[PDB]
Structure formats: C-alpha cells, structure tokens
Design a protein around this ligand. Structure first.
Ligand code: ZN
Length: 234
C-alpha cells in the first residue's frame, strides 16, 4: 500500500554532490507556474499537454508543457477546464515536431476546477512540522484554495519558506546533509520525496522534477506533512 520510510543508506547526501546547489534553490525560491480555468491546446508526446499560460510576473513565457506519468492521465485531463501549479524549468525543455514568445516545461500539477474550492471561499491552512536530527524544532502553515491539492503545490510552498527561514538551499551547498518531505493521508497512506540532489557534479533539473509526473493529490483539509532534515555529518 503505502511507501516505507527511507533506509539510511538511500537518502541523497549533499556532501556527495559537487554541482551548484543554487540550481536546486532556483526551483523553489519564489518560483512557480500558476493558472486558473485553462484547457490544453496542443500536445508533443502522448503523455503531455500544452497550455497557453503567460508568465504574468517576469514575462518569460506564453506557453507551458506539462508531462504526465502516462497516456491515460493525459487523456483524462486533455479536455478538462483545470487549475495549474508547479515548478518549471528551461534547460532541456523540448517542444516541436520539427518546428511545431518563450516556452517553459514542468511535470504534473493539474487539478479540475469545478467542485474543488471551499464553500465560504476561504483558504485552507496546512501544518508543516520540521525535524532536525530527530527533533521537532519548528512548525508553520502554508495555504491553498483547493480542497484536493497536488502534493507538488504543498511541497513547493513548504520549501520556499524553509529557504528563507532555514536557508534550506544556498548557492554553493546546503547546511543540511540529508532531507526528505513525507505526506500522511487521513486513510493511512504515506509517501515521501528526497529533498537533495543526486550524487555527482551536475544537477539535472528536468530529471529531478520528474518525480511529480504522477500528478499526486491529497485532501488539504486532513493531510499531515513532516520535513526530516539531518546535519548528521556537520
Ligand atoms: Zn479553480
């Protein structure tokens, strides 16, 4: 059923990462694609959808391609009016079938608009508990207007806060050696994401963000979230 917690040896270690941690920071530091009530207009590969979404803030794009885990998911949302929220990238973002106004790429992040908001139009607060070397040091809330929200949206908001509050990611490296965010649903199901880059000297943004392609959603009103960091080295 649910995924078992991380084994000690499998968590990515920042000490084994030789690239620029700033490239991971970029993906979560006040960085995200957002849109409401849109419908896809085109496709590239069988598992993706293309939307006309403009970079409101910093005019960097007018088109967005989101890749999904499979062809079924893409077909399911193809003609639906949806809301979008996710972390985008530009390096190795591929479009056109020889040819096929900037463009940007991302994974998952879509939810149906209809019936997915709160009656009183208020926002739902989600508590995030932070653990450092097995100690709950701080806890804070992030918000969403969606009853059923993607795990990606909640993750992004949580890391954005920790970047500023705890300097989660810096340009050169990170004060933490290990890190993973865990979700606990009200039906008992659990799952987690590794918050550190794979070992080596070159961070692959596209490959990392791919973990969101399942378009996983959770009930904002009842889900629990825990961030587990260690400085177990230094
Ligand atoms: Zn909506």
């Amino acid at each position: 059923e649910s995924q078992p917690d991380p084994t000690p040896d499998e968590l990515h270690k920042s000490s084994e990462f030789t690239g620029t941690m700033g490239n991971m920071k970029y993906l979560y530091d006040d960085h995200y694609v957002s849109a409401t009530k849109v419908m896809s207009v085109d496709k590239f590969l069988a598992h993706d959808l293309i939307y006309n979404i403009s970079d409101k803030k910093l005019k960097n794009y007018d088109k967005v391609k989101t890749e999904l885990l499979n062809e079924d998911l893409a077909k399911k949302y193809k003609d639906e009016v949806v809301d979008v929220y996710g972390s985008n990238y530009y390096v190795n973002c591929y479009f056109s079938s020889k040819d096929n106004g900037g463009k940007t790429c991302m994974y998952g992040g879509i939810t149906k608009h209809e019936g997915n908001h709160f009656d009183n139009g208020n926002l739902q607060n989600v508590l995030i508990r932070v653990y450092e070397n097995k100690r709950n040091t701080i806890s804070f809330e992030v918000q969403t207007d969606k009853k059923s929200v993607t795990a990606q949206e909640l993750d992004i908001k949580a890391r954005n806060f920790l970047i500023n509050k705890k300097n989660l990611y810096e340009f050169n490296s990170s004060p933490y050696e290990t890190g993973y965010i865990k979700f606990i649903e009200n039906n008992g199901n659990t799952f987690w994401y590794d918050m550190m880059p794979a070992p080596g000297d070159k961070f692959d943004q596209s490959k990392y963000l791919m973990m969101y392609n399942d378009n996983k959603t959770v009930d904002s009103k009842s889900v629990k979230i825990e961030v587990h960091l260690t400085t177990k080295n230094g």
